[PDB]
Amino acid sequence: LKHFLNTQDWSRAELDALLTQAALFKRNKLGSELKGKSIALVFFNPSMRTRTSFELGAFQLGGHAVVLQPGKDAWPIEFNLGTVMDGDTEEHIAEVARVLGRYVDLIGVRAFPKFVDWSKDREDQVLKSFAKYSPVPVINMETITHPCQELAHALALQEHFGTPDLRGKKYVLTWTYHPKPLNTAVANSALTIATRMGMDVTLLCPTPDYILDERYMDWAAQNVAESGGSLQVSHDIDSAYAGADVVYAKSWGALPFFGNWEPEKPIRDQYQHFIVDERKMALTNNGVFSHCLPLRRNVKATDAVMDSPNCIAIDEAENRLHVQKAIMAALV
Amino acid sequence: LKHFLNTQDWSRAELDALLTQAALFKRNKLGSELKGKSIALVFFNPSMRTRTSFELGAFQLGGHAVVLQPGKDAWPIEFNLGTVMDGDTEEHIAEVARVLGRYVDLIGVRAFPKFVDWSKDREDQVLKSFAKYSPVPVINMETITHPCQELAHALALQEHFGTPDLRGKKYVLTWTYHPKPLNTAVANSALTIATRMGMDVTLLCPTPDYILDERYMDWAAQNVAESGGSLQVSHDIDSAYAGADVVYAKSWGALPFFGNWEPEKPIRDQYQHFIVDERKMALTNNGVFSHCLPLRRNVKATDAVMDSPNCIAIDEAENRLHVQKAIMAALV
Amino acid sequence: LKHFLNTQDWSRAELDALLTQAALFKRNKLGSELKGKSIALVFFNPSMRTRTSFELGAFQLGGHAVVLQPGKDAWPIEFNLGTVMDGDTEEHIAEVARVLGRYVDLIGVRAFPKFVDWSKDREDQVLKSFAKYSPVPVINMETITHPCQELAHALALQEHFGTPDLRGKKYVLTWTYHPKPLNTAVANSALTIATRMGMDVTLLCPTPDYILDERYMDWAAQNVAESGGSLQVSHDIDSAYAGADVVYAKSWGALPFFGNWEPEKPIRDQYQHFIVDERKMALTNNGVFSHCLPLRRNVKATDAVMDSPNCIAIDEAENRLHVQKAIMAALV
């Protein structure tokens, strides 16, 4: 059974086909690819873009999305195997996945890490358990990676430069400030897709402690070797933005300080100058800026940058609708 | 771009057309006016009638409504301009409105005042910000006015008297009791529409402190001059209900005591006799009674009055469905 | 007006017709029985299977379900008659049922007992009030009985044995452990339907204190007399499972300890051995096991039993979709 857990599991030809179908749906949005079919959108965390785009995408293709929130309107779910369920969880994922599988044709799942222990969060237990027990395709709506965001981002870039071939473009994935440590998911995904697309990628971050998990650094290395791009880690702002064609910002807590954010607070607070502003963007080769959203203004990026004509964040957000319809169409 | 923020922004001919389309939809409820289209229903507060009627209205016209709850299932939104977003809000309305605008064809918004400072609540910041940044029409689902309720109310009255011309009818907008101070929204709207319709309006309230905001008292004065009706403020129950054709009840906290409700409590508590009962309704010219709902029985109105054949509250509630379909159809 | 509050209110011919239409829908799931129609699914408690199956069922028949949660996204509702509503409730069921009745064609309602006083919970006030004031058919989505579960369960059994006639089969409704006292609803329903189907029913429970409310014991006695089956209460595990054809497990708090669960805790805790495991199921006549779900693994039933090919819980869950479509189709 084929799922959409990560773009890394898909071949370049399959991803290219997805992006092309997405472009096609953008030209003709109403279709019958999901006529009479349904998708269960399981959210373990809040969402505005993902819930809205998936719900509308199902509707536009003749299907129907059922939105579920375990712990809120639905029952809390247990994922550990061979355990005595006398705690807070009411039912096991083994039953939940099988039951949903008797109702819907697709299952989307959003589950952010707990932020207590990265060693446990990095296993991607929720998503993997759904994929393991579900008899129908499972779609990652964001866990420790955000593959739907990757494709919306990729499409937006191809549309901006007017070509599907992004090789040679200078891509800067820069860390940004936030009063708290966040999920590395979007950063993991940006690094993954930018390298898979063969761009010259530079991972700009405050210190070596902010380098992404080895898993993704390795995916990136393997992607560069196959795509013809390049990977580089940098801690110098100016040399990074210089001649950049694309700048993608995202904040995340240093992995080594996972679970023990107390001492990491004073560390992030001394790098508030990583905020994307006009000065930095002026160093780029008339580069484009984007963010997965939601974005805190004057913290992650300045009002000027957000309101700049070079900001394609709204276009990237729109593309979430189109690429997700291509994904559901391909899996059903 | 045309929005539906207040009936006051619309000409009498445009409002008449809306009411007529509403009557038409009431006769033939299924249509294709919104086929393949969608509306984002953004709720910052609870709702039963508004959410249900809008969701069903979109469905009956071939469209689809996406229900969003910021702070609950969606991310909290910031509305202030040029501010450092390092607080509770995750994203700015500038981005939210633009993003939604890439997904849906219409946006409905419900946001009650905070009740901390009327000077700030009366600016109608949430609704105005959506209308300012949204590339698609915005619909008021209740903020400091409730225009959809106005039209449902107006239609119900025209149906009751069997004519679209309500001039000459004696209309009484009376304040009612409630253990707490409420939003003046529905009262502001009732005063607005009753005068726009040219009726002889009397604003019955305990003391001069319960007179509505000047903005609406002025809209009313201007409406009377154009419609041929009349406006009057009264603090005497009996003289008010006398010969009334319509009685609309609604409770609200005295504006001058906004933010400082402590001393206003003992003031409202000594006017519990404003409750609409059989004795008062018996003084009317076989008048009709209604309320926007939800209504607390034996507090705002008695069981007898609510169960009376002269109570058209259920009809007014139904009409919310029909007038909203006319509104969405007109804006799309 | 015909409602679906309990199978006991329906004749055997009407129930048989429902089960047959359910089997028909299982073969051809898309239809137009609810084209342009809608159902309001009112949930006063969480739900995964019921919300999903009803929402999808409405969709597959061309209709639309509106999901409402009083106290959450909708306003809290008052059910007591002739009372001063100055408390937590905002509106009365008399108005809520009438209003919904002007919007939708069917109303489903889920409301679990409060667990404070069985004498009050057993009156089934919420469901009865909806049926009393609603101008459209009302459907029980689980209160003190779970009739939709009964039919899904019954269909699954007929499919398993390959015949609609279940007379003669040995049916064991066994109590199971849980760190807390639960609703007797599913147990009440299992006893009701198993006897209505004419099976040889044995109510297995720890002590006489765990015998179900007289209302259902009497329904069962009357059912046996009409169906040709039999009813028996047992406190001996081994003699119960012996030669059983079906074993349905469910946990519930002893009625006599309702409201005062403190002393009932040490009582349930000494019967943890009622958990359905391989040893017990091995005593059956190659019997089938099921549970309404959600189910806590290694508490109510063991991993082995749940993963056994004799467990038809997933099939029973699926059937909720089919029998509910038959119910809505019959009532509309």
UniProtKB/Swiss-Prot annotation, chains A, B, C:
Q: Which PANTHER family match?
A: ORNITHINE CARBAMOYLTRANSFERASE, MITOCHONDRIAL (PTHR45753), ORNITHINE TRANSCARBAMYLASE, MITOCHONDRIAL (PTHR45753:SF3)
Activity regulation remarks = Carboxylation at Lys-300 increases the catalytic activity of the enzyme. Is potently inhibited by N(alpha)-acetyl-N(delta)-phosphonoacetyl-L-ornithine (PALAO).
Q: Name one Pfam family in it.
A: OTCace_N
Q: Which gene encodes it?
A: argF'
Q: Where is this site: Key residue in conferring substrate specificity for N-acetyl-L-ornithine versus N-succinyl-L-ornithine?
A: E90
Function, as annotated, reads: Catalyzes the transfer of the carbamoyl group from carbamoyl phosphate to the delta-amino group of N(2)-acetyl-L-ornithine to produce N(2)-acetyl-L-citrulline. This is a step in an alternative arginine biosynthesis pathway. The enzyme has no activity with ornithine.
Where is carbamoyl phosphate bound in this sequence?
S47, M48, R49, T50, W75, R110, H146, P147, C148, Q149, C292, L293, R320
Chain ranges passing through the membrane: none
Q: Does the keyword Cytoplasm apply?
A: yes
* One of the GO biological process terms: citrulline biosynthetic process
From the Swiss-Prot or TrEMBL record, state where the protein is found. Answer: Cytoplasm
Its UniProt pathway annotation is: Amino-acid biosynthesis; L-arginine biosynthesis
Q: How does it assemble?
A: Homotrimer.
What is the recorded phenotype of mutating E90 to A/P/S/V? Generates an enzyme capable of carbamoylation of N-succinyl-L-ornithine while losing its ability to use N-acetyl-L-ornithine as substrate, thus converting it from a N-acetylornithine transcarbamylase (AOTCase) to a N-succinylornithine transcarbamylase (SOTCase)
Binding positions for N(2)-acetyl-L-ornithine per the UniProt entry: E142, K250, L293
Q: Which GO terms describe its cellular component?
A: cytoplasm
The record ties this protein, via Gene3D superfamilies, to: Aspartate/ornithine carbamoyltransferase (3.40.50.1370)
Question: Could you tell me the EC number(s) of this protein?
Answer: 2.1.3.9
Name by which UniProt lists this protein: N-acetylornithine carbamoyltransferase
- Which organism is the protein's source? Xanthomonas campestris pv. campestris (strain ATCC 33913 / DSM 3586 / NCPPB 528 / LMG 568 / P 25)
State the reactions this protein catalyses: N(2)-acetyl-L-ornithine + carbamoyl phosphate = N(2)-acetyl-L-citrulline + phosphate + H(+)
Q: Which residues carry this modification: N6-carboxylysine?
A: K300
In its UniProt record, a GO molecular function of this protein is: N-acetylornithine carbamoyltransferase activity
Entry keyword Oxidoreductase: no
Q: Which UniProt keywords apply?
A: Amino-acid biosynthesis, Arginine biosynthesis, Cytoplasm, Transferase
Organism's domain of life? Answer: Bacteria
